[PDB]
Ferritin heavy chain
Amino acid sequence: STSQVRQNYHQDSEAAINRQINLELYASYVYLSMSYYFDRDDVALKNFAKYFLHQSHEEREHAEKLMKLQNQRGGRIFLQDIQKPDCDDWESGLNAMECALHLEKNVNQSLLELHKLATDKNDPHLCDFIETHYLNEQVKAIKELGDHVTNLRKMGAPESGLAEYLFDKHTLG
Amino acid sequence: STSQVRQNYHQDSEAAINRQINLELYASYVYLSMSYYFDRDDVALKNFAKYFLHQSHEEREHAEKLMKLQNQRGGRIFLQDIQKPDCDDWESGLNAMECALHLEKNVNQSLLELHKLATDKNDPHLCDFIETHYLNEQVKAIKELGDHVTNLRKMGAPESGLAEYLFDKHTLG
Amino acid sequence: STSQVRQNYHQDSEAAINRQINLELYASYVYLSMSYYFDRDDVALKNFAKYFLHQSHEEREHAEKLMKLQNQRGGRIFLQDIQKPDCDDWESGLNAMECALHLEKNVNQSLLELHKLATDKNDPHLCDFIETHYLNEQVKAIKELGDHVTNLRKMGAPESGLAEYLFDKHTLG
Amino acid sequence: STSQVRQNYHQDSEAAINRQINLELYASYVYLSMSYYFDRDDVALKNFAKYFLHQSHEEREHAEKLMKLQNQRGGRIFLQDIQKPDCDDWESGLNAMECALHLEKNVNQSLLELHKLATDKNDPHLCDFIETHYLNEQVKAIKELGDHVTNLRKMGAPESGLAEYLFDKHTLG
Amino acid sequence: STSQVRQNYHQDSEAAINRQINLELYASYVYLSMSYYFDRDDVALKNFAKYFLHQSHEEREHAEKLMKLQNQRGGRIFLQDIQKPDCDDWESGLNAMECALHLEKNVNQSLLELHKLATDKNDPHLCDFIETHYLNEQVKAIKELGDHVTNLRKMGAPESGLAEYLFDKHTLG
Amino acid sequence: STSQVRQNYHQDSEAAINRQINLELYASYVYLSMSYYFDRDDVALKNFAKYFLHQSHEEREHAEKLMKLQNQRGGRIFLQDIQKPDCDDWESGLNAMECALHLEKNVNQSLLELHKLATDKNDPHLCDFIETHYLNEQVKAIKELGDHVTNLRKMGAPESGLAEYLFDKHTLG
Ligand code: NA
Ligand code: NA
Ligand code: NA
Ligand code: NA
Ligand code: NA
Ligand code: NA
Ligand code: NA
C-alpha cells in the first residue's frame, strides 16, 4: 500500500499535514462567520465584511495547497469535521480583528510545530514548503492585524461607532 | 367593453394594480420632498439630496411599469390624486432615512398583498410580474436603508452634525 | 427664521413659485395619463404614447427647476396634492393634442402672471429666470401643438383612423 | 424504467408537456401557412409574410425548449401528428391577425392550465419554467396582435387595400 | 431584538435557511474530497479532479448566497459543524459521479422542501429566490451528472481503465 | 381562378410539389425526434443530438423553398397533416443513422419521380429547380450517412458503447 512516489515522507509528517488541513479549513470557516456578521443590517460595515471574506477564501486556498502537497508526497488525505466557530456574534470590528489576530497566531504556532517536525524527520522538502508558502504569509498577516488593532484602539473603537465607520472607509476601503 | 387581449385577469387584480400605481406615485413624491429638503441652504447635504432624487425617479419608473402591465393585460388605468407627503421638513438625514425605511416597508406590504391576491385569483403571470420586478427590489431597498440608519445612529446622528456630514461624503458620495 | 441667503425675495413671489410647482407637477400627470391612453390595445398609437411621455418627463424637470429656484432664493417649498387629470379616456390623437394645447396655454398664462408679479416686486432675478427658462419654452410648445392640431385636422382626424395612423408614423415617428 | 434524473416530476405533468409540445408545433404550422398565403402573387404583402414566418420559427423554438425540459426532468417525449391548419386561404391581413390573436389566446390558456397542474402537483421547477419562458412571452404576443388588429381596423381594413398596404410598409416593415 | 428590516419572514423559514447553508457547505466539502481523490498518484485523472474542484467552489458560492439572503431578510445566521464526507476513497470516476448524482438529488429534495415551506408561510420573496437561484441550477446539475454516469457505464467503466481515461480527456477536458 | 403568373405549370406538377412539401416536413419531424432521443439522460450523445437537429432545420428550409416555388409558379399550397415518426425510441446511434439513410433514399426517390414528371410535362424550369436545389444535396446526404454507417459498424457499434462515444466525439464533434 506504500505509494510509488513516496520518498523520505514520515507517517508523523503525513498526520501533521492532515491536522493542518483541518486547521486551515477551520480558519476559513471562522473568517466566513466574521464576514457575514459585518453584513448584518445592525452592523453594516461592508469593508469589514469584504476583508474577512477575502481572508476566508485565502485560508481555503492554503488548505487546498496542503492537500496538493499530501498527494505530491504520496501521503493520504483524511478529512475531519470542520468545527463551527466559537462565536456567532463578533461584537465589533475591533473584537473581530483581535479574534483574527489570536487565530492567526494559533495557525502560526501549528506551522512552527510542523516545521520543527519536518526538521526532526530530516524532511527538507517539507520544511522548505512550509517556509516558502506559509511562514512569511503568517508573519505578514499577524503584522497587518496588529496594525489594524492598533489603529482601531487609537481611533477610539469600539465605544466610538465613528471610529469603526472611518476605519472601514479609509483603511479597509 | 371587455378588452380583446384580456385573459385570466380578475377585476380585483385590476383594481389592486390601480391602487399600487397611486402608491408608487405617492412614494415618488415623498422622495422628491425629501430631496429638496436636503438642498435647502440651512441643511446643505448634497449627497442626501442626490440619493433621494434618485429614489424619486426610480419610484416613478415603478409606477410606469405598472401602468404598462395594466394595459398589457387589458385592464384600464384609473388615476387618482397624488397626496402630499406627511412632512414638509424632514428634520435630519437620519430622520429622513427612517421615514424612507417606513415608506419602503409600507410599499412592500402592499406588494405582498398584491401577490397574495394574484395567487388567490390563479393569475400566475401577475404573480410572476410582482416577484420578478418588485419583491427583490423592495428587499434590497429595505436592507440598504436599514444599513444607512444603522451607520448614522452608530456615528452619532442626528446630534452630531459631523456624523451626517461624513456620511454624506463617504457613504452617499 | 429668515434664510441667510434671502435677498430681494418677496413672500408673494415665494407663494407664486409654490403654486407654479404644483401646476407643473399637475401638467406632468396629465401628460402621463395621455401617454398611457395611447398605449391601450384599443388605441395603439405608440408614437403618440412616446410624445406624451416625453412631455410628462419635461414637465417634471420644469417643476424640479422651480424647486431648485425656491431653495436658491431662500424660500421654502410647500407641496400640495397633485390633482388627477380631468379625463381618463382622451378619445383621439386630435382630442389629446387639443387638450395639450389648452393645458400649455394655461401654464403659459400662469407664468406670465408670475413674471408680472416679479416685475411688480422689482425682482429682476426672478423675472429673468422665468424669461430664460420658461417663456420661450412655452411659446415653442404652443406653436408645436398648434401645428400638430392643424395637420391632424387637415388630414381628416379624428373621423379618419388612417389620418392618426399616418400622423403617428410620419410626424411623431 | 424510472429515469435516474427524475425527481418530483408527476406522470400528469409529463403528459401535459407532451400535449404542449404538439400545440406549439401546431402553432408553428399555422403561422407557416399564413406566411406563404401572404407570399401569393394575388396577395403580395411581403412584410405580413415575413412577420408570420418569424412567428412560425419562434413557435418551433418554443416546442424545442419543451422537449429539452422533458428530457431535463427525465420524462419521455411522445410525438403526435401535427394537424393541418384550419384554413388554406387566410382572406386578408386583418383576418390573419385576428386568427393569430385567437391562436395565441388558445396557447396561453393551455399554458395557464399547465401552470395550475404544476402548482397542484407541487412542482415549483416546472411552474417557474412556464412563468419564466412562456407566460410573459404570451402576454406580449397577445398585446402586439391586439395592437395590430386595432390599427388595421382603424385604418379601414379589410375593405381598404390601401390600409393593408400601408400597414405592411409602416408597421411590419 | 427583531431586525429593523424583517418583514414577512417566518422563524421556520429562517431555521430552514440555516439548515440549507450547512447542507451546501457539506456538499462543498464532499466535492473537495472527491477532487483530491482524483489528484492521487494512484488515480491520476486530472480532469475529474478539476471537475469536482469546480463543483466544490460552486457549492460554497451557493452557501454564501444563502447567508446573504438570511441577512437581507433580517434573519440571523447560525453556523454548525461541517460533517466530514462519507468516504475518503471514492473508488472510481463512475462511483464518484454516482455519489455526486445522489448528493445533488439530496440537495434538490431539501430545496423543494424549503420552497414548500416558503409557499406555506406565504413568503413569495423566499419562494422566488429559491426558484430563481437554486431549482433550475439543481435540475441542470442532475441532468449533467446523469449524462456522465450514462456515458461512463456505456464506455465500460469502471472495469475499463481506458474508459475513464478517455472520458477524462474527451468529456471533462 | 388561374393565377396571372402561371405559365407552363401543369396541375400534376402542382400536386406533386404539394406532396413533396409534406414529405420534407415529415423528414424534418423525424430528425427532430431523433435529435431529442440523443438528448435523453440514458442516451447522452450530444453531438448525435446536434447532428440530427441540424438535419431537422435543413429539411424545414427545403420545405419552405418548395412553398416559395409553388407561389412563384402560381400554384396553390395545400398543407396536410404531418405524420408522427415511425419510432419514439431510436435504439442507438447506428440504428438512427441507418434510419436516416433509409429516409434520405425515400426522399431522393420522390424527387427523382418529380423530376421525371417535370420532364414528361416539358417543364424545364421545374426540372432545373429540382436538379439545382435538391438532387446533388440528396446525393451528398446519402453519401455522408453511408460513410457514417460504415464507420460506426467498423468501430463495433452498436454493441460497443465506446464506439458510439468516440464517433460522437471525433466525427460528429
Ligand atoms: Na492559513
Ligand atoms: Na416602488
Ligand atoms: Na417565479
Ligand atoms: Na412646464
Ligand atoms: Na408558443
Ligand atoms: Na448547491
Ligand atoms: Na430534404
The CA atoms of residues 6 and 74 of chain A lie 5 Å apart. Chain A is about 70% helix and 0% strand. The longest helix of chain A spans residues 124-155. The helical segments of chain A are 11-38, 46-72, 93-120, 124-155, 161-170.
